[PDB]
Design a protein around this ligand. Sequence first.
Ligand SMILES: NC(=O)c1cccc([C@@H]2O[C@H](COP(=O)([O-])OP(=O)(O)OC[C@H]3O[C@@H](n4cnc5c(N)ncnc54)[C@H](O)[C@@H]3O)[C@@H](O)[C@H]2O)[nH+]1
Ligand SMILES: NC(=O)c1cccc([C@@H]2O[C@H](COP(=O)([O-])OP(=O)(O)OC[C@H]3O[C@@H](n4cnc5c(N)ncnc54)[C@H](O)[C@@H]3O)[C@@H](O)[C@H]2O)[nH+]1
Ligand SMILES: [Zn+2]
Ligand SMILES: [Zn+2]
Ligand SMILES: [Zn+2]
Ligand SMILES: [Zn+2]
Lengths: 374, 374
Amino acid sequence: STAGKVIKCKAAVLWEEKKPFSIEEVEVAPPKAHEVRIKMVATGICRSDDHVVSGTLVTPLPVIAGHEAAGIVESIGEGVTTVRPGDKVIPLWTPQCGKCRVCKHPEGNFCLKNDLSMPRGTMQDGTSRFTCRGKPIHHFLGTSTFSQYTVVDEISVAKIDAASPLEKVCLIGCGFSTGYGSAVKVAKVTQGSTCAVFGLGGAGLSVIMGCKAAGAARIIGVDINKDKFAKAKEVGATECVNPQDYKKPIQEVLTEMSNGGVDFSFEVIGRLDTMVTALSCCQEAYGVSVIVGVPPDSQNLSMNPMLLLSGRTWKGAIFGGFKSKDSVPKLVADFMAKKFALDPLITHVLPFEKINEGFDLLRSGESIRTILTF
Amino acid sequence: STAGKVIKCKAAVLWEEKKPFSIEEVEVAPPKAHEVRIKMVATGICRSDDHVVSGTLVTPLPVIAGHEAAGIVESIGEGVTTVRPGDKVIPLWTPQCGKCRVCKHPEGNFCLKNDLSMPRGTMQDGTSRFTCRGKPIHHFLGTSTFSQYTVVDEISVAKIDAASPLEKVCLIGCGFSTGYGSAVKVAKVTQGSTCAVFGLGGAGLSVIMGCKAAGAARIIGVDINKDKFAKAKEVGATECVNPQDYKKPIQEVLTEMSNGGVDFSFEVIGRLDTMVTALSCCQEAYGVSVIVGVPPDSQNLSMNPMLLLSGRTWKGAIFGGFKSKDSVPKLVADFMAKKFALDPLITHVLPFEKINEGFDLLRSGESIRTILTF
Ligand SMILES: NC(=O)c1cccc([C@@H]2O[C@H](COP(=O)([O-])OP(=O)(O)OC[C@H]3O[C@@H](n4cnc5c(N)ncnc54)[C@H](O)[C@@H]3O)[C@@H](O)[C@H]2O)[nH+]1
Ligand SMILES: NC(=O)c1cccc([C@@H]2O[C@H](COP(=O)([O-])OP(=O)(O)OC[C@H]3O[C@@H](n4cnc5c(N)ncnc54)[C@H](O)[C@@H]3O)[C@@H](O)[C@H]2O)[nH+]1
Ligand SMILES: [Zn+2]
Ligand SMILES: [Zn+2]
Ligand SMILES: [Zn+2]
Ligand SMILES: [Zn+2]
């Protein structure tokens, strides 16, 4: 009843930066060869989507943002083998074409066929499957999840568990996996180690969950906001430290506490000042500090190279270093296996109509993860 | 004829920074429990020794510098089990007490019982085995090789091959191993990879030799001095690139050449500007850049964290990441196995008396490695 035809649905359209979203009547052109048109069931609200509004993350406007979401596959274009309609799936904003240097590398995940480095806000072919009143509307990271219907290439889609609670597994599209992966895939936390996590947002609680999956025995959560200590502890942190409690710098107190600097340090804030500090507090002779995320408008951080000479690794990553297509199904299955839980992060669920409302929550103040439902 | 007694010998004493060395009549007190008094056969001249003179590397003055050298063990104090006199050995400026976090870690090498972080210029006990005309003379990195006789703790000494040509294996005490290790132990170059080396000094040629031992198929040597291209090529670089030849920045041209950035980038110069560039030119999604060495007077390098988000590892290290005591013997054996050669680096051998003369060569202009002989 929809397959093969242009669907007219509602979606949050950003006509211009620094403007609220407009729930628009949009047309979602059918999917061509290797495209898959999905039915959004749930999409989360993430800082990255908010960056677009501000201009910080420059990508073509007008646009339908959204990249953390899970839904049901309605139609599949030609050659689509990885999915069949009815499939619970999660759009992947970091692809896995399985053919470039990066996908072929046993480590890298940042697929070359991504639309992050040099945003086009289009599908692979250079075109757009969106139009509002005849006017073409841009795609975001080849996903555009703030729409009741979306069309993503086959490389930007992943089949997940049919029993997946879509109001909760959507987190695995960005937030959870970006954190969890930093600990379990990038930094590669080890049984016994002592981790320190800067920032206790949702991405933070995910890193803490990763460290726990890894076996870290000590997970020190650090945040200038005391109110973030409960979740974190409840989520896994064995102790939290509010930097404004001391008279000395935190890395000093993280070293004293750790007796020589932590094994792995994670920064899930985005400050440049804290970025250096997170490095400065891991073991000088073998500490690994991971920058989980950086503001896309960031500038030059001032840092003394001595920090690295000691033998300190500094790593960055996109999407918790997971190889999206390969990984997402497995992250899901695990959640489905009753390992990690995603609830403590979902602090709000709002009907998709309340999108602009979900953002204010994000923007000003704490709302770990707001899940917008369709 | 010497064992158990205070030896009176000659050594280069630095009475004050920014002063030439004085070949001094010094007394070398016998070795206590766990000390080993060595007979220097050969010691190389390294930038680090020169830093001391300048003040750059702050360590107690007066002092007998030197840390890259190999010789013969004359007497061994109490409990010394790792050596017996007659033993060809190499002092290790980065210890291996085999008891701290670092030695116990399967990776770190920067032994806690080092004298680099907070120089004391003494042996483990806080004392000095040196005196010139009754006045006590400081030790350097617990080695002090610019002396015909020296006393190093057992953790700062390594037994090598009895067939070791000491005029050539001394390189394995700092220079060679610092480079070679950056490629083969820290960055961990892989069969097939494409490496890029900034700076073609001796430490550079050593990194290139490491990459070769690893299997890198492409080893791009970069240096503003055309005259360094022969050795490097001869040593392993498949092609060298002089940055002053182009109109565009080098990392640009290293990426164009490598089609997407090199696999591993090494910086064996010490510039802060080049440090960032070396990072900026390795694969954004999985490139590892290694800072082989940094000036001990360095300042804050300005760098945009975006560089790491892509998935770029940045690592530093001391002594090519080798675990000195465990490693040195094996590096030697390998050389002795006719694998790598150390000759192309030894561009000068000068009688120890000509020490101040060896430095001018180091200081002003190219002299890959000057070996001072006893
Ligand atoms: N928004 C996301 O879902 C998301 C996803 C992936 C990566 C990230 C990275 O995590 C960064 C923050 O977003 P988030 O972690 O999900 O949540 P967030 O932006 O609410 O969390 C940042 C946390 O760090 C805290 N903080 C601020 N300053 C300091 C400081 N000086 N020292 C210690 N703690 C401090 C702050 O209180 C908050 O708890 C984000 O900016 C991005 O760089 N965020
Ligand atoms: N001196 C040593 O034996 C030694 C040992 C271990 C580590 C190191 C590291 O290597 C650093 C240099 O000492 P070395 O490599 O043994 O020899 P070095 O100091 O003679 O070599 C530095 C090389 O880099 C070259 N160079 C300078 N500027 C540039 C630039 N802008 N771009 C490209 N190339 C440039 C320079 O021509 C020289 O060939 C040293 O400062 C230290 O940080 N050095
Ligand atoms: Zn996101
Ligand atoms: Zn790819
Ligand atoms: Zn040296
Ligand atoms: Zn040790």
